Amino acid sequence: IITVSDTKEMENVMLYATKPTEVMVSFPHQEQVLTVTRLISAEIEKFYV
Amino acid sequence: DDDDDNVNTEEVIMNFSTPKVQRFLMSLKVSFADKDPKDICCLVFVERR
Amino acid sequence: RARTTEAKFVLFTADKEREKTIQQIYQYRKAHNDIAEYLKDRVLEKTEP
């Protein structure tokens, strides 16, 4: 393998390359589910059987 | 809740979705509230087909 | 892919997965640093298997 290693080469890469800002979006994860989900699960199980 | 099917669509989407979906669409709205469509160029990646 | 300047990168993970995912991303960033520095410092004269 070979690659550019010098700082001037690094900035030259930054001319066409970019290090985008990396951020997060956390969300609250819950486990409860609705009843109609249970109904449809039962229907699909009947269909599968 | 109400009769206005547009804001009702917004409201049900906010309400009939997992916190993950709500949060993602929230971030999507806030990031591109009223910018020029030309000025924005974004991708979204998801796993399943 | 976010190859433009001032590019914004967004991630979505569950609250329960926050520590695991952030540790994984630190693993990834440190792996990037490791590959970069090991390639830089590692000097081989033969340059051929």
């Binding site: 951020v23 956390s26 609705l34 | 309400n15 979705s17 949060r23 971030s27 | 991630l11």
Partner: peptide, 16 residues
């Protein structure tokens, strides 16, 4: 339950 939980308006794109 007939209800999913909302999420607050105040989130910020915490640096990761």
């Amino acid at each position: 339950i007939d209800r999913y939980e909302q999420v607050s308006k105040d989130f910020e794109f915490i640096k990761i």
